[PDB]
C-alpha cells in the first residue's frame, strides 16, 4: 500500500469490468455462474472443459 502525490493529466471514459461472470457450455447449455473476477488489471482464463 503506497501513498503518492501527483497531478492527473488524463481520465479515461468510465467502462464496465465484471466482478462476477457466468459462462455457459455450448452443447449441454449448463452454466458455471458467479465466477469471481480478480480486481484490477487482471484477466481470466475460461475453463477448457
Amino acid at each position: 500500500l503506497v501513498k503518492i502525490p501527483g497531478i492527473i493529466i488524463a481520465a479515461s471514459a468510465v467502462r464496465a469490468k465484471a466482478t462476477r461472470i457466468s459462462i455457459q457450455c455450448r452443447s449441454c447449455r449448463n452454466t458455471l455462474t458467479n465466477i469471481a473476477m480478480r480486481p484490477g488489471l487482471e484477466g481470466y482464463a475460461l475453463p477448457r472443459k
Binding site: 457466468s22 452443447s27 449441454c28 447449455r29 449448463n30 452454466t31 455462474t33
Partner: protein
C-alpha cells in the same frame, strides 16, 4: 422376418418428455427427447436437466414426465427351416410401445419392420462396421390358429348348423 424368439430383454421405460420443477423459482420446465435410435445423436440431444440457469436444482416430475417402454428381442432362424448343418443366424429387434410384450422366448413370430444400422458411439476412429437392428412396426404370432375371424355369414351358418340337427350333430 420370421423366426423364433431366443431372448427378450426386460421392458424398460425410455423417457421422451421430462418435466422438472424448480423449487427455488417455482418454474416448471419440459424437455423433449426425440427418437434418435437409428439417427445421429449429438450429446446436446441427451442431456438430462439437473440445474436451473442460475444453478438452482431441479426436481423431476415423474408423474408428469412421459415415458415409452422399450424392449429388445432376438429372432433366430427357426430350427426346422435352418439349413440342417450349420449354426443359427439371428437378428436383433427393437420393440417399442404397444409392441413390447408381444413375444416371449420360444415364440414363433413374424416381425415386420425397418432394417437399420445403429449409430456407434462418438469416436475419432471407426472401423467401418455397423451394428444392425430391425425396428418393428408390427409383431404377429405364428398362431394364426390361435385367433379366429368370424363374419356375420359365418356366425349365421354356425347357428343354422346347430339348430338344424341338434341330435346327431355330434356324430
Amino acid at each position: 422376418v420370421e423366426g423364433i424368439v431366443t431372448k427378450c430383454s426386460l421392458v424398460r421405460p425410455k423417457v421422451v418428455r421430462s418435466v422438472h420443477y424448480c423449487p427455488a423459482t417455482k418454474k416448471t420446465i419440459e424437455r423433449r427427447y426425440s427418437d434418435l435410435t437409428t439417427l445421429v445423436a449429438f450429446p446436446s440431444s441427451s442431456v438430462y436437466p439437473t440445474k436451473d440457469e442460475e444453478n438452482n436444482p431441479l426436481e423431476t416430475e415423474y408423474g408428469l414426465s412421459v415415458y415409452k417402454d422399450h424392449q429388445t428381442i432376438t429372432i433366430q432362424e427357426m430350427p426346422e427351416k435352418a439349413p440342417a448343418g450349420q449354426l443359427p443366424r439371428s437378428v436383433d429387434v427393437i420393440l417399442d410401445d404397444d409392441l413390447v410384450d408381444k413375444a416371449k422366448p420360444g415364440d414363433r413370430v413374424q416381425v415386420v419392420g425397418t432394417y437399420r444400422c445403429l449409430p456407434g458411439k462418438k469416436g475419432g476412429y471407426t472401423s467401418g462396421t455397423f451394428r444392425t437392428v430391425l425396428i418393428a412396426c408390427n409383431v404377429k404370432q405364428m398362431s394364426k390358429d390361435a385367433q379366429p375371424s368370424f363374419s356375420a355369414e359365418d356366425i349365421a351358418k354356425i347357428k343354422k348348423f346347430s339348430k338344424t340337427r341338434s341330435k346327431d350333430i355330434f356324430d
